[PDB]
Amino acid sequence: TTGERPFSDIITSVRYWVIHSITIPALFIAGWLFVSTGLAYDVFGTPRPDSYYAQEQRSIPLVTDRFEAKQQVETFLEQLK
Amino acid sequence: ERGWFDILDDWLKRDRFVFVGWSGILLFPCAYLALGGWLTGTTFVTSWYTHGLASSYLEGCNFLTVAVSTPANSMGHSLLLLWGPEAQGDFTRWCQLGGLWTFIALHGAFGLIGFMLRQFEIARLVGVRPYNAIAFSAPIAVFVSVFLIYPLGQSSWFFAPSFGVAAIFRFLLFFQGFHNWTLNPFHMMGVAGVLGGALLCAIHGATVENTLFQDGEGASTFRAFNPTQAEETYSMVTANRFWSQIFGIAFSNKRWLHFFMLFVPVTGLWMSAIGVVGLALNLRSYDFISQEIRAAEDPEFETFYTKNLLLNEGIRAWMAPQDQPHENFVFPEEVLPRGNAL
Amino acid sequence: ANLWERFCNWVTSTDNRLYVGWFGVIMIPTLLAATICFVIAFIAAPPVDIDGIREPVSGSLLYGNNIITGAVVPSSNAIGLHFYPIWEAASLDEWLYNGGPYQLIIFHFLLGASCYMGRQWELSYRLGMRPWICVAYSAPLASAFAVFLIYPIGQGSFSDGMPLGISGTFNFMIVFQAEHNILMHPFHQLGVAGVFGGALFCAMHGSLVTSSLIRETTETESANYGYKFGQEEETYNIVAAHGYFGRLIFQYASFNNSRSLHFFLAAWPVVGVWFAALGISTMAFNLNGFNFNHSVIDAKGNVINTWADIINRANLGMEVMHERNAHNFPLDLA
Amino acid sequence: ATNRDQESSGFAWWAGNARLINLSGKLLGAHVAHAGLIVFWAGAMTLFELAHFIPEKPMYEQGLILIPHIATLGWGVGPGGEVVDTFPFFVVGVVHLISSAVLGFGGVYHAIRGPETLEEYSSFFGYDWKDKNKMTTILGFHLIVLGIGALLLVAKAMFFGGLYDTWAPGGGDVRVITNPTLDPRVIFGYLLKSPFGGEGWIVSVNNLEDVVGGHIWIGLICIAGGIWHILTTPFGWARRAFIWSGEAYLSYSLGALSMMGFIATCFVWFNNTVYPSEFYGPTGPEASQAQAMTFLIRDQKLGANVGSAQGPTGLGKYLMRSPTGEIIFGGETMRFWDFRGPWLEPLRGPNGLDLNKIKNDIQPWQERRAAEYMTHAPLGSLNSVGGVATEINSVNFVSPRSWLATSHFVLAFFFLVGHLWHAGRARAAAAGFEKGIDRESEPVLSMPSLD
Amino acid sequence: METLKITVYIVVTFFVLLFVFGFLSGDPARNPKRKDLE
Amino acid sequence: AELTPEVLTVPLNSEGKTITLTEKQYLEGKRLFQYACASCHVGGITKTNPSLDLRTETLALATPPRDNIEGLVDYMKNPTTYDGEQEIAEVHPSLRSADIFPKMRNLTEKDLVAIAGHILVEPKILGDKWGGGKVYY
Ligand code: CLA
Ligand code: CLA
Ligand code: CLA
Ligand code: CLA
Ligand code: CLA
Ligand code: HEC
Ligand SMILES: CC1=C(/C=C/C(C)=C/C=C/C(C)=C/C=C/C=C(C)/C=C/C=C(C)/C=C/C2=C(C)CCCC2(C)C)C(C)(C)CCC1
Ligand SMILES: CC1=C(/C=C/C(C)=C/C=C/C(C)=C/C=C/C=C(C)/C=C/C=C(C)/C=C/C2=C(C)CCCC2(C)C)C(C)(C)CCC1
Ligand SMILES: CC1=C(/C=C/C(C)=C/C=C/C(C)=C/C=C/C=C(C)/C=C/C=C(C)/C=C/C2=C(C)CCCC2(C)C)C(C)(C)CCC1
Ligand SMILES: CCCCCCCCCCCCO[C@@H]1O[C@H](CO)[C@@H](O[C@H]2O[C@H](CO)[C@@H](O)[C@H](O)[C@H]2O)[C@H](O)[C@H]1O
Ligand SMILES: CCCCCCCS[C@@H]1O[C@H](CO)[C@@H](O)[C@H](O)[C@H]1O
Ligand code: OEX
Ligand SMILES: [Ca+2]
Ligand SMILES: [Cl-]
Ligand SMILES: [Cl-]
């Protein structure tokens, strides 16, 4: 043994569960709301189901330049009306 | 001298639940970020703008189809730093441009360095020979040759493997269609090392478990072993006779047996790495010239070699337009190679 | 001691350089027949009409093959699963054109290798060993049954059995991928875990035991001379190896019991290869890998491609090109 | 805690059911409790199938494996296999469900409440694995029970409605079997057929007269042998060839079950008589034939002479000869010419497929059947996408024949492993070295060197 | 061909009978420890 | 892109009248088409006769024209060959032959409209994918 309290000691202690019956559901709900509020879409730049194409377009908005790639994507994003 | 360096050395080598060490300063941040970036990307990040692919749980992919895909072919071999000229410090564009792929690949590379330094560092502290670190050179040679050297020989990072289950499957199939990689004798040696390694693993473990000495009374024989016991727990003499009579030859030297188990998979992975270094340059073992000369002139000559090239030609023509979108391949129906009816 | 008793004592004798035994009585003649026929056919056999469309494929060295392209070619699709011994042909020349040798080899081989497993059980009983080495060998043995017998039965023809050759093996694997999407099947995935894992644990166990060898030699001699065949004492320090590997990860991720360590080394690759053989064996009845073709759709109904759709593009190219002259109707149902 | 820990019993918890080997009262309960689970699944799965069952979809479009078994026995179905009354299905499921409560009650009683050993309680119900006489008697009782079971199928076939006959003139129907085959040349002739293509061993039985007649023989055989094994005790040649222990008898059964599982796998894959295609979907051979039939019909209506149409290889595009001359469908289905089915046989003459029947006698119900079977080929993905591996999502279909064949191949395989495991161990335990080599008595050290 | 067929038929029956009578000839007693398994 | 009322507006008959479907009808059309028709028509092709597909251009050139709701509804009652010359209810699922194609037994008039709408709307979404076969997968 290396000194730390045994894991079976901690996870059968009442205090562990007093703390973690809050903290575990709380993180879960924070993860839920990150998606449910739409925030994950905008953090990572992921398209919503109505944002992959324009209404009539069937072309992929593929990046084709290295140093204007950022403007290419912003331009593609405007073109969604 | 007990200066700050020596004090810090003491704390870094405390015998705790997770050993740290000097090597841990490199290993833990890089291994954690490589992992977290893969989890972040497969959960939240698209491949729409680089590949035309959905690739995250958020888009509706599952564990088999998510990936952190490679950057677009127009990025070349750009390091794709967050603060680089492409993303210009924009975290969202960085993700949409494939920045997570270099992030994972680069932090992964330095994490593996860290892990091998940890094997050296822990072995030096405990007093064993560093053969475990020497064996780990093979995974590093595979990683470096497939994820870094291969795409550096090609046009861009786009053709490196993507970090995902089905994405890797596509890599296998691309290597068959374009590189005829099954024909490559360096892959063949790799296959022999991996399969022979699996064989050695099963046969050694089966042999030990079935030549045990009866060192206890219970029907569960696991209990009858003590880590500090001096005697061997199974009979090498009986093991050797059985295999001599079953198979003709047998191990008799236990040190040789275990060195050979190190040797076989390690060597195979090194051999496969060399082949991939060739494929970085399209230096393939694609054809046998004598077969082609005969087949060109003699339309009755057919081998499994000519049969498989027909398959490769199908793979190339049918997957290329969607697998390489930046190329804008437009193949009309009439040019697609097809057999009768299908 | 009458003659039958003498013969039985010689067959079952633990003093023969190679153990014969009762399985050996079936094993030896069947393996010789398969080996001799294989060698001759690989060198000199004429081309074989594998797919039944009067389009013979050349497999032997004398007819234009090297070691990599050569094969014993599976028997004709016109034969299907019919039994085709030499005596059912009007001539040897007919037998060879239709791929008779393939049947003779695999049927003799599968019997021989099955008796080889029996022989592994049998000698262990004669030596007072525990009996389960043969169980480890059932995983490669089951795999051979899968590609030589089970898959033909489910597809209805030995012409879809694996060819006896190196490039022939690759043909089998590529057509399998196109018709079953084996890469997307969880039993092939467990098989990959089995053999990647088995190779990992092989190098691991080898490196750990080699790392903890007890100093018994000088720097100018091989360390292998520090172990003597039959010595009573262990040749390495398993406490040292556990103390190293336990700190590489954490203490409870390392084995201290050699017996359970070696059991794990047996079990992991054997179980994984069992699943891989069950993959081939159940795709033999067209229960194929996961199909996510066009699974992701946008708000309008546009297909959003995933990596699974790219795989499908590659599978289509294999599908449309394989056996290019053998299909007349639009669906390849077997 | 009798033999309920490792110190006392010698067995770790992960081999804990081995602690039951010599505790016949608790071993009885574990067997009865397990049978309750089998019956439980049968009744419950049947109810689930019924609840999800739409009478106007084909059974094989609905993931049914149990209702097809009930229907083959003559219940719920009329001409063509059309479902006319789902209440028999309901009854079968309910009665199995209720019975499982009786078995579970007995299993849990004998397992945790009744006497742990039956020998001190009853000399009839008690037994010694080593008692060759008692063991063949217990075996004798169960052979008589199994024989009654086989006669019940005959009773249903001959006296209680009959069986569904896919071959019945008209399109298939329930039919009373009035003259089951009794000629032992026929019944045991099936036993001696080759298992290879065109022969098919017992999988080839293609009429209910043979099926019913074979169960009459099996019924008598089992009842005869059961009386034989009650009245006798193993002969000396049998005493010397077998291990006589509980694990050994377990290992023999495991070998038997594996063999049966493989046979069952081939039965459901090839046989369309006792697994009617109306209920289970077409066999793999059947759907492939049905594709060729379909396109011969399409192109002949467009004006093609199918007898003389040379395909790209030089073989006929639609028709060709089998290796023994028979006229058969062309293309890759040449491998399937051994297929026989009620929709195809009217086109068959003495030389195989008959060009004049093909030109003049193809009825629309055959065009329908061939198109149905061609489009329900037993091909599909693990997530139940029907079709070839390259097909797109749309059709939610995997054939019952694929489900049944794959499941039972996997089970049969692992039961062969179990045979090897337990037969090897049984041998070693009888001989006294199943726990390891005796250090001071190692056999190999008393043997001369090989060289 | 007919001679070939009978020859193989005879060779195979020969070896199969050895196998069967072999394992019938007291095989459980052919072990190094307890030699009484009836 | 999304499923707008414009996408869902389709020709009701040949005289040029349109009708606008709800998203509910369209999804009902998709489900019922999977139930009764996709075993042969998955993706707009025809597995038992690949010469005839369900592309709107092909349906326009059928006799009588099938490129509208009325033509498609009529076809599911009394199907004909492409030239209109022969009635093929005996070999093609239809209400007239619901006794030999039992899956048609529980299709109502309103179901036929929804299946029709799905056939007319899908090519507007998938373009060449619809009726294109494996080349466009
Ligand atoms: C079909 C599956 C099955 C069955 C029928 C059994 C049966 C048995 N096991 Mg085994 N076992 C099994 C699977 C099974 N096991 C598995 C999967 C494992 C791995 C974990 C084991 C590991 C194991 C060990 C290590 C041991 C056993 C033992 C036993 C026996 C005594 C159990 C006992 O006394 O507990 C008492 C348990 C309780 C009092 C709790 C409740 C148990 C009841 C019976 C559950 C009933 C619930 C049910 C819904 C009630 C319906 C009633 C209703 C119909 C009226 C009993 C005959 C023991 C033995 O061999 O003794 C000699 C023993 O030591 N088992
Ligand atoms: C009728 C069949 C049968 C019977 C009565 C037995 C009986 C026995 N077996 Mg044997 N065995 C069998 C078939 C059978 N076996 C088969 C088919 C195999 C091949 C795999 C084996 C392989 C085997 C081994 C290797 C061993 C035994 C052992 C034993 C003994 C102890 C078993 C125990 O307590 O396990 C306890 C039960 C468990 C721990 C449960 C295991 C859980 C399984 C693997 C899960 C399977 C997954 C499931 C199907 C699907 C997932 C479900 C999930 C999603 C919820 C007991 C005499 C032991 C022995 O030798 O004693 C003499 C032993 O070491 N058996
Ligand atoms: C004889 C065995 C058998 C067979 C052939 C079938 C077949 C079927 N079932 Mg049924 N069923 C069974 C047993 C069986 N079932 C059991 C035991 C249960 C209780 C759980 C059920 C409860 C059930 C329900 C609730 C449903 C079905 C449904 C179905 C249909 C679709 C199946 C599917 O999509 O699976 C998906 C594929 C898998 C789940 C793959 C499982 C992989 C396993 C876990 C691997 C394990 C291998 C081995 C056992 C372990 C060995 C371990 C080793 C170490 C020894 C199909 C006809 C569906 C249907 O359509 O009904 C109308 C449905 O809804 N079944
Ligand atoms: C086949 C499995 C089986 C076997 C071998 C036994 C054997 C035994 N039981 Mg158990 N038992 C079982 C199943 C079994 N039982 C079931 C399913 C239940 C729940 C109903 C019980 C509930 C039970 C209780 C409460 C008791 C026993 C007792 C006994 C012992 C004395 C029985 C006796 O002499 O009755 C005399 C014989 C009869 C009364 C004949 C019964 C005929 C049956 C009921 C008619 C139908 C039989 C026919 C085959 C039906 C086939 C159904 C099948 C196909 C599903 C004996 C060891 C006694 C005991 O343990 O004493 C300490 C005891 O008190 N059993
Ligand atoms: C559950 C079924 C069952 C079981 C487990 C037993 C078990 C036994 N029987 Mg019994 N028997 C049974 C049913 C059963 N019997 C039935 C239904 C009958 C009436 C037909 C008999 C009539 C009977 C007689 C007359 C005798 C036995 C005897 C025995 C004992 C010797 C077994 C043996 O050595 O076989 C091994 C089998 C052989 C040696 C012959 C097979 C030859 C080789 C292996 C080729 C066959 C393999 C091949 C692949 C099979 C494919 C199919 C084939 C038809 C072509 C053993 C305890 C013997 C005994 O001791 O009685 C007291 C004995 O003399 N039984
Ligand atoms: C296989 C048994 C089929 C099923 C199920 C369905 N259809 Fe079908 N369809 C099938 C064939 C062989 C043909 C060609 C018939 C001919 O000889 O002309 C068709 C044709 C159609 C058409 C006409 C297509 C055209 O371009 O004119 C339509 C509109 C059509 N089928 C619709 C349809 C519907 C709505 C179905 C479900 C109720 C359906 N089909 C099922 C084969 C099969
Ligand atoms: C990228 C990046 C970064 C990082 C981040 C991170 C670090 C993250 C992490 C993250 C994480 C850390 C995540 C995690 C996740 C996890 C999960 C999501 C899990 C899941 C699981 C499951 C699902 C399970 C399953 C299973 C198995 C596996 C087996 C057993 C059984 C079961 C089934 C249970 C930074 C900021 C620096 C910068 C920017 C970029
Ligand atoms: C011994 C043992 C064991 C086992 C046990 C078992 C196995 C048991 C079984 C049991 C059983 C086997 C039971 C059963 C029961 C049943 C029941 C309880 C039923 C009921 C039913 C009902 C109630 C019904 C109802 C109904 C009707 C009538 C009509 C229709 C509808 C419905 C469904 C509603 C274990 C492993 C745990 C371990 C320990 C030991
Ligand atoms: C019902 C029916 C039928 C009939 C059937 C029959 C009649 C059957 C019989 C069957 C039989 C009658 C079988 C038998 C079997 C047997 C076996 C399977 C055996 C085995 C053996 C063994 C296993 C042995 C072994 C050994 C050896 C070899 C050596 C010595 C030692 C020992 C003993 C180990 C038919 C088809 C008509 C139709 C359908 C229905
Ligand atoms: C198609 C397969 C047909 C198989 C038919 C099987 C029928 C069974 C009838 C009994 C036949 C067994 O006949 C068997 O033969 C030999 C003599 O040749 C006997 O003799 C044996 O005795 C002992 C047995 O412990 C052995 O050590 C000895 O090596 C051997 O000679 C066996 O004790 C006898 O059991
Ligand atoms: C073992 C439970 C038996 C319950 C009773 C089953 C009767 S079965 C019944 O028998 C009739 C003949 O009289 C047939 O006409 C009818 O179709 C059939 O269902
Ligand atoms: O032979 Mn060899 O490969 Ca199984 O699919 Mn059909 O057949 Mn042929 O085609 Mn694809
Ligand atoms: Ca008796
Ligand atoms: Cl091919
Ligand atoms: Cl074809």
Author numbering:
A (entry chain E): 4 to 84
B (entry chain D): 11 to 352
C (entry chain A): 11 to 344
D (entry chain C): 23 to 473
E (entry chain I): 1 to 38
F (entry chain V): 1 to 137
What do the study authors state?
Based on the light illumination conditions determined, we analyzed the PSII structure in the S2 state at 2.4 Å resolution. The flow of the PSII microcrystals was excited by a single flash to advance the S state to S2. We refined the 10 ms light dataset as a mixture model consisting of 70% S2 state and 30% S1 state for the Mn4CaO5 cluster, its nearby residues, the region around QB and the BCT binding site. The OEC structure in the S2 state was in the open-cubane form, in which the right side of the O5 is open, giving rise to the five-coordinate trigonal bipyramidal coordination of Mn1. Upon transition to the S2 state, W665 in the O4 channel becomes highly disordered. This is accompanied by slight shifts of the nearby residues D1–D61 and CP43-E354 toward the position of W665, resulting in a narrowing of the space that has been occupied by W665 [Figs. 3(e) and 5(b)]. The B factor of the QB head was decreased from 123 Å2 in the S1 state to 101 Å2 in the S2 state, and the features of the isomorphous difference Fourier map suggest a shortening of the hydrogen-bond interaction between the head of QB and D1-S264, indicating a tighter binding of the semi­quinone QB − to D1-S264.
